[PDB]
Protein backbone atom coordinates (compact mmCIF):
# COMPACT_ATOMS: atom_id res chain seq x y z
CA UNK A 303 0.00 0.00 0.00
CA UNK A 304 1.12 3.59 -0.64
CA UNK A 305 1.39 6.09 2.21
CA UNK A 306 -1.65 7.84 0.75
CA UNK A 307 -3.76 4.69 0.73
CA UNK A 308 -2.72 3.96 4.34
CA UNK A 309 -3.53 7.58 5.36
CA UNK A 310 -6.87 7.31 3.59
CA UNK A 311 -7.82 4.11 5.43
CA UNK A 312 -6.67 5.53 8.80
CA UNK A 313 -8.88 8.64 8.23
CA UNK A 314 -12.00 6.59 7.50
CA UNK A 315 -11.39 4.20 10.34
CA UNK A 316 -10.73 7.02 12.87
CA UNK A 317 -13.86 8.93 11.73
CA UNK A 318 -15.90 5.81 12.08
CA UNK A 319 -14.51 5.39 15.57
CA UNK A 320 -15.53 8.97 16.57
CA UNK A 321 -19.01 8.07 15.30
CA UNK A 322 -19.04 4.96 17.57
CA UNK A 323 -17.96 7.01 20.62
CA UNK A 324 -20.95 9.35 19.96
CA UNK A 325 -23.32 6.35 19.85
CA UNK A 326 -21.95 5.18 23.22
CA UNK A 327 -22.45 8.71 24.65
CA UNK A 328 -26.03 8.97 23.43
CA UNK A 329 -27.12 5.45 24.47
CA UNK A 330 -28.18 6.89 27.87
CA UNK A 331 -30.36 9.52 26.08
CA UNK A 332 -32.55 6.93 24.27
CA UNK A 333 -36.05 6.21 25.55
CA UNK A 334 -35.70 2.74 27.12
CA UNK A 335 -37.18 -0.32 25.43
CA UNK A 336 -40.46 -1.36 27.06
CA UNK A 337 -39.68 -4.39 29.22
CA UNK A 338 -43.31 -4.46 30.10
CA UNK A 339 -45.72 -7.32 30.60
CA UNK A 340 -45.44 -6.92 26.77
CA UNK A 341 -49.25 -7.26 26.75
CA UNK A 342 -49.60 -7.23 22.91
CA UNK A 343 -51.04 -3.74 23.15
CA UNK A 344 -50.99 -0.96 20.58
CA UNK A 345 -49.19 1.36 23.01
CA UNK A 346 -46.04 -0.71 23.59
CA UNK A 347 -45.65 -1.47 19.87
CA UNK A 348 -45.53 2.30 19.24
CA UNK A 349 -42.97 2.61 22.07
CA UNK A 350 -40.74 -0.03 20.46
CA UNK A 351 -41.04 1.62 17.03
CA UNK A 352 -40.30 5.06 18.49
CA UNK A 353 -37.25 3.66 20.35
CA UNK A 354 -36.02 2.25 17.02
CA UNK A 355 -36.59 5.57 15.23
CA UNK A 356 -34.20 7.15 17.80
CA UNK A 357 -31.43 4.67 17.02
CA UNK A 358 -32.01 5.49 13.31
CA UNK A 359 -31.85 9.20 14.03
CA UNK A 360 -28.57 8.69 15.83
CA UNK A 361 -27.16 6.79 12.85
CA UNK A 362 -28.44 9.22 10.23
CA UNK A 363 -26.76 12.12 12.06
CA UNK A 364 -23.45 10.20 12.41
CA UNK A 365 -23.50 9.38 8.65
CA UNK A 366 -23.87 13.11 7.77
CA UNK A 367 -20.82 13.89 9.97
CA UNK A 368 -18.82 10.91 8.78
CA UNK A 369 -19.28 11.94 5.13
CA UNK A 370 -17.65 15.35 5.71
CA UNK A 371 -14.58 13.41 6.92
CA UNK A 372 -14.40 11.26 3.78
CA UNK A 373 -11.60 12.69 1.61
CA UNK A 374 -13.10 14.27 -1.48
CA UNK A 375 -16.68 14.55 -0.27
CA UNK A 376 -16.37 18.28 0.43
CA UNK A 377 -15.08 19.00 -3.10
CA UNK A 378 -18.52 18.14 -4.56
CA UNK A 379 -21.13 20.88 -4.77
CA UNK A 380 -23.56 20.95 -1.83
CA UNK A 381 -26.48 19.76 -4.00
CA UNK A 382 -24.57 16.57 -4.94
CA UNK A 383 -23.45 15.93 -1.30
CA UNK A 384 -27.13 16.08 -0.38
CA UNK A 385 -28.10 13.76 -3.28
CA UNK A 386 -25.41 11.22 -2.50
CA UNK A 387 -26.31 11.17 1.22
CA UNK A 388 -30.06 10.93 0.52
CA UNK A 389 -29.56 7.72 -1.48
CA UNK A 390 -26.65 6.09 0.39
CA UNK A 391 -27.70 6.67 4.03
CA UNK A 392 -30.04 3.65 4.25
CA UNK A 393 -27.39 1.53 2.53
CA UNK A 394 -24.73 2.61 4.99
CA UNK A 395 -27.10 1.82 7.89
CA UNK A 396 -27.62 -1.67 6.46
CA UNK A 397 -23.84 -2.22 6.25
CA UNK A 398 -23.36 -0.96 9.81
CA UNK A 399 -26.23 -3.23 10.94
CA UNK A 400 -24.73 -6.31 9.24
CA UNK A 401 -21.41 -5.51 10.96
CA UNK A 402 -23.24 -5.72 14.33
CA UNK A 403 -25.14 -8.98 13.64
CA UNK A 404 -24.00 -11.89 15.83
CA UNK A 405 -24.45 -15.12 13.93
CA UNK A 406 -24.26 -17.20 17.13
CA UNK A 407 -27.15 -15.47 18.95
CA UNK A 408 -28.93 -14.36 15.76
CA UNK A 409 -29.04 -10.91 17.45
CA UNK A 410 -27.97 -7.36 16.45
CA UNK A 411 -26.21 -4.98 18.86
CA UNK A 412 -26.68 -1.23 18.32
CA UNK A 413 -24.96 1.64 20.14
CA UNK A 414 -23.00 0.06 22.99
CA UNK A 415 -25.23 -2.65 24.62
CA UNK A 416 -28.65 -2.57 23.00
CA UNK A 417 -29.23 -6.01 21.55
CA UNK A 418 -32.23 -7.18 19.56
CA UNK A 419 -33.59 -10.47 18.24
CA UNK A 420 -35.57 -11.00 15.04
CA UNK A 421 -38.79 -10.96 17.07
CA UNK A 422 -37.87 -7.59 18.66
CA UNK A 423 -38.14 -5.93 15.24
CA UNK A 424 -41.35 -7.83 14.56
CA UNK A 425 -42.70 -6.46 17.84
CA UNK A 426 -42.12 -2.84 16.77
CA UNK A 427 -44.48 -3.40 13.83
CA UNK A 428 -41.97 -3.91 11.03
CA UNK A 429 -43.18 -6.18 8.23
CA UNK A 430 -41.65 -9.63 7.48
CA UNK A 431 -40.76 -8.43 3.98
CA UNK A 432 -38.43 -5.88 5.65
CA UNK A 433 -37.03 -7.96 8.51
CA UNK A 434 -36.15 -11.20 6.76
CA UNK A 435 -33.98 -9.83 3.89
CA UNK A 436 -32.03 -7.64 6.32
CA UNK A 437 -31.15 -10.74 8.37
CA UNK A 438 -30.27 -12.74 5.26
CA UNK A 439 -27.97 -9.90 4.16
CA UNK A 440 -26.35 -9.65 7.60
CA UNK A 441 -25.40 -13.33 7.70
CA UNK A 442 -24.05 -13.08 4.15
CA UNK A 443 -21.90 -10.12 5.22
CA UNK A 444 -20.57 -12.18 8.13
CA UNK A 445 -19.26 -14.97 5.84
CA UNK A 446 -16.91 -12.45 4.26
CA UNK A 447 -15.43 -11.57 7.64
CA UNK A 448 -14.62 -7.98 6.74
CA UNK A 449 -12.32 -6.10 9.08
CA UNK A 450 -12.47 -2.33 9.90
CA UNK A 451 -10.48 -1.15 6.85
CA UNK A 452 -12.71 -3.17 4.53
CA UNK A 453 -16.06 -1.93 5.99
CA UNK A 454 -14.82 1.67 5.88
CA UNK A 455 -13.66 1.49 2.28
CA UNK A 456 -16.89 -0.21 1.20
CA UNK A 457 -18.82 2.61 2.81
CA UNK A 458 -16.75 5.31 1.01
CA UNK A 459 -17.27 3.43 -2.27
CA UNK A 460 -21.02 3.39 -1.52
CA UNK A 461 -21.10 7.16 -0.94
CA UNK A 462 -19.43 7.88 -4.28
CA UNK A 463 -21.94 6.05 -6.50
CA UNK A 464 -22.49 8.12 -9.65
CA UNK A 465 -25.80 6.56 -10.64
CA UNK A 466 -27.78 8.17 -7.76
CA UNK A 467 -30.76 10.37 -8.71
CA UNK A 468 -30.32 14.14 -9.11
CA UNK A 469 -26.51 14.02 -9.23
CA UNK A 470 -25.21 16.96 -11.37
CA UNK A 471 -21.57 15.86 -11.71
CA UNK A 472 -21.77 12.05 -11.99
CA UNK A 473 -18.37 11.80 -13.76
CA UNK A 474 -16.83 13.71 -10.93
CA UNK A 475 -18.41 11.38 -8.38
CA UNK A 476 -17.01 8.38 -10.26
CA UNK A 477 -13.54 9.89 -10.30
CA UNK A 478 -13.71 10.44 -6.49
CA UNK A 479 -14.85 6.83 -6.06
CA UNK A 480 -11.96 5.29 -7.96
CA UNK A 481 -9.18 5.78 -5.36
CA UNK A 482 -11.39 3.93 -2.79
CA UNK A 483 -11.98 1.02 -5.21
CA UNK A 484 -8.20 0.94 -5.83
CA UNK A 485 -7.35 0.93 -2.12
CA UNK A 486 -9.88 -1.80 -1.45
CA UNK A 487 -8.40 -3.87 -4.31
CA UNK A 488 -4.81 -3.44 -3.09
CA UNK A 489 -5.80 -4.06 0.54
CA UNK A 490 -7.74 -7.34 -0.11
CA UNK A 491 -4.83 -8.56 -2.26
CA UNK A 492 -2.41 -8.01 0.59
CA UNK A 493 -4.63 -9.31 3.42
CA UNK A 494 -5.97 -12.52 1.83
CA UNK A 495 -3.66 -13.08 -1.15
CA UNK A 496 -5.09 -16.57 -1.78
CA UNK A 497 -8.82 -15.70 -1.82
CA UNK A 498 -9.07 -13.78 -5.06
CA UNK A 499 -12.89 -13.78 -5.09
CA UNK A 500 -13.18 -11.78 -1.87
CA UNK A 501 -12.89 -8.41 -3.56
CA UNK A 502 -15.65 -9.07 -6.20
CA UNK A 503 -17.79 -10.72 -3.47
CA UNK A 504 -17.61 -7.46 -1.44
CA UNK A 505 -18.65 -5.36 -4.42
CA UNK A 506 -21.49 -7.83 -5.08
CA UNK A 507 -22.80 -6.68 -1.70
CA UNK A 508 -23.19 -3.21 -3.16
CA UNK A 509 -25.62 -4.85 -5.58
CA UNK A 510 -27.64 -6.48 -2.79
CA UNK A 511 -27.84 -3.13 -0.98
CA UNK A 512 -29.71 -1.59 -3.93
CA UNK A 513 -32.43 -4.16 -3.63
CA UNK A 514 -32.61 -3.65 0.15
CA UNK A 515 -32.95 0.06 -0.35
CA UNK A 516 -36.01 -0.70 -2.46
CA UNK A 517 -37.39 -2.97 0.26
CA UNK A 518 -36.90 -0.07 2.69
CA UNK A 519 -38.94 2.29 0.46
CA UNK A 520 -41.84 -0.22 0.56
CA UNK A 521 -41.60 -0.42 4.35
CA UNK A 522 -41.80 3.38 4.69
CA UNK A 523 -44.63 3.31 2.15
CA UNK A 524 -46.48 0.75 4.31
CA UNK A 525 -45.99 3.21 7.19
CA UNK A 526 -47.85 5.95 5.26
CA UNK A 527 -50.73 3.46 4.68
CA UNK A 528 -50.81 2.63 8.43
CA UNK A 529 -50.69 6.30 9.53
CA UNK A 530 -47.35 5.84 11.32
CA UNK A 531 -45.31 9.00 10.77
CA UNK A 532 -41.52 9.20 10.93
CA UNK A 533 -39.69 11.85 12.95
CA UNK A 534 -38.63 15.02 11.02
CA UNK A 535 -34.97 14.10 10.30
CA UNK A 536 -36.04 10.65 8.96
CA UNK A 537 -39.06 12.03 7.11
CA UNK A 538 -36.77 14.60 5.48
CA UNK A 539 -34.55 11.86 3.85
CA UNK A 540 -37.02 9.09 3.06
CA UNK A 541 -40.61 10.35 2.62
CA UNK A 542 -41.71 11.49 -0.82
CA UNK A 543 -44.40 13.80 0.66
CA UNK B 544 -6.66 -18.81 -19.51
CA UNK B 545 -7.18 -22.57 -19.07
CA UNK B 546 -8.93 -24.66 -21.77
CA UNK B 547 -12.04 -25.05 -19.55
CA UNK B 548 -12.33 -21.26 -19.25
CA UNK B 549 -11.77 -20.69 -22.98
CA UNK B 550 -14.44 -23.36 -23.64
CA UNK B 551 -16.95 -21.66 -21.35
CA UNK B 552 -16.32 -18.13 -22.67
CA UNK B 553 -16.54 -19.22 -26.29
CA UNK B 554 -19.77 -21.07 -25.49
CA UNK B 555 -21.38 -17.89 -24.19
CA UNK B 556 -20.14 -15.75 -27.08
CA UNK B 557 -21.39 -18.25 -29.72
CA UNK B 558 -24.68 -18.78 -27.88
CA UNK B 559 -25.22 -15.05 -27.84
CA UNK B 560 -24.61 -14.74 -31.58
CA UNK B 561 -26.83 -17.73 -32.50
CA UNK B 562 -29.71 -16.34 -30.32
CA UNK B 563 -29.41 -13.02 -32.09
CA UNK B 564 -29.00 -14.46 -35.63
CA UNK B 565 -32.11 -16.66 -35.44
CA UNK B 566 -34.47 -13.94 -34.04
CA UNK B 567 -40.40 -11.63 -36.37
CA UNK B 568 -43.62 -9.91 -37.63
CA UNK B 569 -44.65 -6.89 -35.52
CA UNK B 570 -47.37 -4.27 -35.05
CA UNK B 571 -46.56 -1.40 -37.47
CA UNK B 572 -45.07 1.80 -36.03
CA UNK B 573 -47.43 4.71 -36.90
CA UNK B 574 -50.79 12.74 -31.31
CA UNK B 575 -53.98 10.73 -30.62
CA UNK B 576 -54.65 8.08 -27.92
CA UNK B 577 -55.02 5.27 -30.51
CA UNK B 578 -51.47 6.16 -31.63
CA UNK B 579 -49.98 6.08 -28.10
CA UNK B 580 -51.39 2.54 -27.63
CA UNK B 581 -49.98 1.77 -31.09
CA UNK B 582 -46.40 2.75 -30.39
CA UNK B 583 -46.67 1.05 -27.01
CA UNK B 584 -48.02 -2.16 -28.52
CA UNK B 585 -45.10 -2.00 -30.93
CA UNK B 586 -42.37 -1.75 -28.24
CA UNK B 587 -44.10 -4.32 -26.07
CA UNK B 588 -43.73 -6.72 -29.03
CA UNK B 589 -40.02 -5.90 -29.53
CA UNK B 590 -39.57 -6.62 -25.80
CA UNK B 591 -41.18 -10.04 -26.15
CA UNK B 592 -38.75 -10.83 -28.97
CA UNK B 593 -35.90 -9.93 -26.60
CA UNK B 594 -37.38 -12.01 -23.81
CA UNK B 595 -37.36 -15.02 -26.15
CA UNK B 596 -33.69 -14.46 -26.96
CA UNK B 597 -32.71 -14.16 -23.32
CA UNK B 598 -34.62 -17.30 -22.28
CA UNK B 599 -33.05 -19.30 -25.13
CA UNK B 600 -29.57 -17.93 -24.22
CA UNK B 601 -29.95 -18.76 -20.49
CA UNK B 602 -30.74 -22.48 -21.12
CA UNK B 603 -27.33 -22.66 -22.89
CA UNK B 604 -25.35 -21.02 -20.11
CA UNK B 605 -23.49 -23.93 -18.45
CA UNK B 606 -24.88 -24.36 -14.94
CA UNK B 607 -28.42 -23.17 -15.68
CA UNK B 608 -29.97 -26.62 -16.24
CA UNK B 609 -28.20 -28.02 -13.15
CA UNK B 610 -30.72 -25.86 -11.18
CA UNK B 611 -34.23 -26.95 -10.25
CA UNK B 612 -37.05 -25.63 -12.40
CA UNK B 613 -38.20 -23.30 -9.63
CA UNK B 614 -34.83 -21.55 -9.39
CA UNK B 615 -34.54 -21.42 -13.17
CA UNK B 616 -37.80 -19.53 -13.30
CA UNK B 617 -36.87 -17.33 -10.36
CA UNK B 618 -33.46 -16.29 -11.87
CA UNK B 619 -34.98 -15.57 -15.29
CA UNK B 620 -37.83 -13.53 -13.83
CA UNK B 621 -35.33 -11.30 -12.04
CA UNK B 622 -32.65 -11.23 -14.76
CA UNK B 623 -34.78 -10.57 -17.76
CA UNK B 624 -35.24 -6.80 -17.42
CA UNK B 625 -31.56 -6.38 -16.46
CA UNK B 626 -30.26 -8.32 -19.48
CA UNK B 627 -32.67 -6.38 -21.69
CA UNK B 628 -31.19 -3.13 -20.43
CA UNK B 629 -27.73 -4.49 -21.16
CA UNK B 630 -28.85 -5.46 -24.72
CA UNK B 631 -30.45 -2.06 -25.14
CA UNK B 632 -27.21 -0.30 -24.10
CA UNK B 633 -25.39 -2.37 -26.75
CA UNK B 634 -27.78 -1.10 -29.45
CA UNK B 635 -27.36 2.57 -28.50
CA UNK B 636 -25.63 4.60 -31.18
CA UNK B 637 -23.66 7.41 -29.52
CA UNK B 638 -23.54 9.41 -32.79
CA UNK B 639 -27.32 9.46 -33.54
CA UNK B 640 -28.50 9.25 -29.87
CA UNK B 641 -30.82 6.45 -31.10
CA UNK B 642 -31.36 2.77 -30.23
CA UNK B 643 -31.71 0.06 -32.88
CA UNK B 644 -33.74 -3.12 -32.42
CA UNK B 645 -33.59 -6.06 -34.87
CA UNK B 646 -31.17 -4.60 -37.49
CA UNK B 647 -33.74 -2.06 -38.62
CA UNK B 648 -36.17 -0.57 -36.10
CA UNK B 649 -34.62 2.67 -34.84
CA UNK B 650 -35.89 5.04 -32.13
CA UNK B 651 -34.91 8.23 -30.31
CA UNK B 652 -35.60 9.54 -26.80
CA UNK B 653 -38.68 11.29 -28.23
CA UNK B 654 -40.06 8.08 -29.76
CA UNK B 655 -40.05 6.47 -26.29
CA UNK B 656 -42.00 9.43 -24.87
CA UNK B 657 -44.55 9.42 -27.72
CA UNK B 658 -45.43 5.81 -26.67
CA UNK B 659 -46.33 6.93 -23.14
CA UNK B 660 -43.36 5.85 -21.06
CA UNK B 661 -42.49 7.93 -17.94
CA UNK B 662 -39.59 10.37 -18.35
CA UNK B 663 -38.40 8.92 -14.99
CA UNK B 664 -37.96 5.61 -16.89
CA UNK B 665 -36.53 6.89 -20.17
CA UNK B 666 -33.83 9.23 -18.88
CA UNK B 667 -32.16 6.63 -16.59
CA UNK B 668 -32.13 4.02 -19.42
CA UNK B 669 -30.40 6.52 -21.76
CA UNK B 670 -27.93 7.50 -19.00
CA UNK B 671 -27.09 3.83 -18.46
CA UNK B 672 -26.76 3.19 -22.21
CA UNK B 673 -24.18 5.88 -22.79
CA UNK B 674 -22.24 4.97 -19.63
CA UNK B 675 -22.16 1.39 -20.91
CA UNK B 676 -20.73 2.53 -24.25
CA UNK B 677 -17.86 4.37 -22.52
CA UNK B 678 -16.84 1.14 -20.87
CA UNK B 679 -16.55 -0.44 -24.34
CA UNK B 680 -17.13 -4.08 -23.33
CA UNK B 681 -16.17 -6.71 -25.92
CA UNK B 682 -18.33 -9.75 -26.81
CA UNK B 683 -16.72 -11.96 -24.14
CA UNK B 684 -17.07 -9.29 -21.43
CA UNK B 685 -20.80 -8.75 -22.22
CA UNK B 686 -21.53 -12.49 -22.34
CA UNK B 687 -19.69 -13.13 -19.07
CA UNK B 688 -21.46 -10.19 -17.37
CA UNK B 689 -24.81 -11.61 -18.36
CA UNK B 690 -24.04 -15.09 -16.96
CA UNK B 691 -22.81 -13.45 -13.76
CA UNK B 692 -26.08 -11.46 -13.65
CA UNK B 693 -28.15 -14.59 -14.12
CA UNK B 694 -26.55 -16.46 -11.21
CA UNK B 695 -27.32 -13.92 -8.46
CA UNK B 696 -28.22 -15.94 -5.41
CA UNK B 697 -30.12 -13.01 -3.80
CA UNK B 698 -33.00 -12.89 -6.33
CA UNK B 699 -36.52 -13.28 -4.93
CA UNK B 700 -37.79 -16.86 -4.39
CA UNK B 701 -34.47 -18.72 -4.83
CA UNK B 702 -34.46 -22.04 -2.95
CA UNK B 703 -30.83 -23.06 -3.39
CA UNK B 704 -28.88 -19.81 -3.09
CA UNK B 705 -25.68 -21.63 -2.09
CA UNK B 706 -25.81 -23.55 -5.39
CA UNK B 707 -26.55 -20.43 -7.47
CA UNK B 708 -23.61 -18.63 -5.89
CA UNK B 709 -21.38 -21.67 -6.47
CA UNK B 710 -22.31 -21.55 -10.19
CA UNK B 711 -21.68 -17.80 -10.45
CA UNK B 712 -18.13 -18.30 -9.12
CA UNK B 713 -16.43 -19.75 -12.26
CA UNK B 714 -17.90 -16.98 -14.46
CA UNK B 715 -16.54 -14.41 -12.04
CA UNK B 716 -13.09 -16.13 -12.10
CA UNK B 717 -13.21 -16.23 -15.89
CA UNK B 718 -14.01 -12.53 -16.13
CA UNK B 719 -11.21 -11.70 -13.71
CA UNK B 720 -8.64 -13.65 -15.77
CA UNK B 721 -10.00 -12.39 -19.07
CA UNK B 722 -9.68 -8.72 -18.03
CA UNK B 723 -6.20 -9.35 -16.53
CA UNK B 724 -4.93 -10.81 -19.83
CA UNK B 725 -6.90 -8.70 -22.36
CA UNK B 726 -6.47 -5.36 -20.50
CA UNK B 727 -3.36 -5.75 -18.34
CA UNK B 728 -2.78 -2.00 -17.68
CA UNK B 729 -6.43 -1.22 -16.71
CA UNK B 730 -6.66 -2.58 -13.15
CA UNK B 731 -10.15 -1.19 -12.42
CA UNK B 732 -11.77 -2.68 -15.53
CA UNK B 733 -13.12 -5.59 -13.68
CA UNK B 734 -14.67 -3.68 -10.73
CA UNK B 735 -16.21 -1.08 -13.07
CA UNK B 736 -17.98 -3.94 -14.86
CA UNK B 737 -19.32 -5.48 -11.67
CA UNK B 738 -20.48 -1.96 -10.66
CA UNK B 739 -22.88 -2.00 -13.63
CA UNK B 740 -24.66 -4.86 -11.89
CA UNK B 741 -25.37 -2.32 -9.12
CA UNK B 742 -26.84 0.17 -11.63
CA UNK B 743 -28.98 -2.58 -13.08
CA UNK B 744 -30.54 -3.45 -9.69
CA UNK B 745 -31.70 0.11 -9.34
CA UNK B 746 -32.91 0.14 -13.00
CA UNK B 747 -34.99 -2.89 -12.06
CA UNK B 748 -36.82 -0.95 -9.34
CA UNK B 749 -37.33 1.95 -11.72
CA UNK B 750 -38.94 -0.57 -14.09
CA UNK B 751 -41.28 -1.94 -11.36
CA UNK B 752 -42.35 1.68 -10.82
CA UNK B 753 -43.05 1.99 -14.59
CA UNK B 754 -45.04 -1.25 -14.51
CA UNK B 755 -47.06 0.09 -11.57
CA UNK B 756 -47.71 3.35 -13.49
CA UNK B 757 -49.08 1.30 -16.42
CA UNK B 758 -51.50 -0.54 -14.08
CA UNK B 759 -53.16 2.66 -12.83
CA UNK B 760 -53.02 4.19 -16.37
CA UNK B 761 -55.16 1.28 -17.74
CA UNK B 762 -52.28 0.09 -19.97
CA UNK B 763 -51.96 -3.69 -20.10
CA UNK B 764 -48.81 -5.74 -20.57
CA UNK B 765 -49.36 -8.48 -23.19
CA UNK B 766 -49.61 -11.97 -21.61
CA UNK B 767 -45.94 -13.02 -22.09
CA UNK B 768 -44.67 -9.88 -20.38
CA UNK B 769 -47.49 -10.03 -17.82
CA UNK B 770 -46.25 -13.48 -16.64
CA UNK B 771 -42.92 -11.88 -15.77
CA UNK B 772 -43.72 -8.45 -14.34
CA UNK B 773 -47.29 -8.16 -13.01
CA UNK B 774 -48.13 -9.12 -9.39
CA UNK B 775 -50.43 -12.17 -8.98
Ligand SMILES: O=C(O)Cc1cccc(OCCCN(Cc2cccc(C(F)(F)F)c2Cl)CC(c2ccccc2)c2ccccc2)c1
Pocket residue numbers: 322325351354355357358360361392395396398399410411412413414423428432433434436437518521522532
Ligand atom coordinates in the same frame (compact mmCIF):
# COMPACT_ATOMS: atom_id res chain seq x y z
O1 LIG C 1 -25.55 1.23 16.33
C1 LIG C 1 -24.88 2.26 16.06
O2 LIG C 1 -23.82 2.57 16.66
C2 LIG C 1 -25.34 3.31 15.06
C3 LIG C 1 -26.37 2.66 14.19
C4 LIG C 1 -25.96 2.02 13.02
C5 LIG C 1 -26.88 1.34 12.24
C6 LIG C 1 -28.22 1.31 12.60
C7 LIG C 1 -28.64 1.94 13.77
O3 LIG C 1 -29.95 1.93 14.16
C8 LIG C 1 -30.96 1.23 13.44
C9 LIG C 1 -32.14 1.04 14.37
C10 LIG C 1 -33.00 -0.16 13.96
N1 LIG C 1 -33.81 0.00 12.77
C11 LIG C 1 -34.56 1.25 12.64
C12 LIG C 1 -34.94 1.78 11.28
C13 LIG C 1 -33.99 2.06 10.31
C14 LIG C 1 -34.35 2.60 9.06
C15 LIG C 1 -35.66 2.88 8.74
C16 LIG C 1 -36.69 2.65 9.65
C17 LIG C 1 -38.12 2.96 9.32
F1 LIG C 1 -38.21 3.77 8.27
F2 LIG C 1 -38.72 1.79 9.04
F3 LIG C 1 -38.69 3.54 10.38
C18 LIG C 1 -36.35 2.09 10.98
CL1 LIG C 1 -37.65 1.80 12.20
C19 LIG C 1 -34.26 -1.19 12.07
C20 LIG C 1 -33.12 -2.05 11.49
C21 LIG C 1 -33.60 -3.43 11.20
C22 LIG C 1 -32.79 -4.51 11.49
C23 LIG C 1 -33.23 -5.80 11.26
C24 LIG C 1 -34.47 -6.05 10.71
C25 LIG C 1 -35.31 -4.99 10.43
C26 LIG C 1 -34.86 -3.69 10.67
C27 LIG C 1 -32.55 -1.43 10.26
C28 LIG C 1 -33.34 -1.17 9.15
C29 LIG C 1 -32.78 -0.56 8.04
C30 LIG C 1 -31.42 -0.24 8.01
C31 LIG C 1 -30.64 -0.52 9.12
C32 LIG C 1 -31.21 -1.10 10.24
C33 LIG C 1 -27.72 2.62 14.56
Ligand SMILES: O=C(O)Cc1cccc(OCCCN(Cc2cccc(C(F)(F)F)c2Cl)CC(c2ccccc2)c2ccccc2)c1
Pocket residue numbers: 586587589590591592593624627628630631642643644645646655660664665666668669753754764
Ligand atom coordinates in the same frame (compact mmCIF):
# COMPACT_ATOMS: atom_id res chain seq x y z
O1 LIG D 1 -33.73 -5.73 -31.00
C1 LIG D 1 -33.41 -6.88 -30.69
O2 LIG D 1 -32.60 -7.54 -31.36
C2 LIG D 1 -33.99 -7.60 -29.51
C3 LIG D 1 -34.28 -6.63 -28.38
C4 LIG D 1 -33.25 -6.33 -27.49
C5 LIG D 1 -33.45 -5.40 -26.47
C6 LIG D 1 -34.68 -4.77 -26.34
C7 LIG D 1 -35.71 -5.07 -27.23
O3 LIG D 1 -36.92 -4.47 -27.06
C8 LIG D 1 -37.03 -3.06 -27.05
C9 LIG D 1 -38.31 -2.70 -26.38
C10 LIG D 1 -38.32 -1.21 -26.05
N1 LIG D 1 -38.91 -0.98 -24.73
C11 LIG D 1 -40.14 -1.66 -24.39
C12 LIG D 1 -40.18 -2.16 -22.98
C13 LIG D 1 -39.14 -2.87 -22.41
C14 LIG D 1 -39.24 -3.29 -21.08
C15 LIG D 1 -40.36 -3.03 -20.29
C16 LIG D 1 -41.45 -2.32 -20.78
C17 LIG D 1 -42.69 -1.99 -19.97
F1 LIG D 1 -42.64 -2.54 -18.77
F2 LIG D 1 -42.75 -0.66 -19.88
F3 LIG D 1 -43.78 -2.44 -20.57
C18 LIG D 1 -41.38 -1.87 -22.18
CL1 LIG D 1 -42.73 -0.95 -22.91
C19 LIG D 1 -38.49 0.18 -23.93
C20 LIG D 1 -36.97 0.35 -23.80
C21 LIG D 1 -36.60 1.76 -23.48
C22 LIG D 1 -35.39 2.27 -23.97
C23 LIG D 1 -35.04 3.59 -23.70
C24 LIG D 1 -35.84 4.41 -22.92
C25 LIG D 1 -37.04 3.92 -22.43
C26 LIG D 1 -37.41 2.61 -22.71
C27 LIG D 1 -36.44 -0.56 -22.77
C28 LIG D 1 -36.89 -0.50 -21.45
C29 LIG D 1 -36.40 -1.38 -20.49
C30 LIG D 1 -35.43 -2.31 -20.84
C31 LIG D 1 -34.98 -2.36 -22.16
C32 LIG D 1 -35.48 -1.49 -23.12
C33 LIG D 1 -35.52 -6.00 -28.24
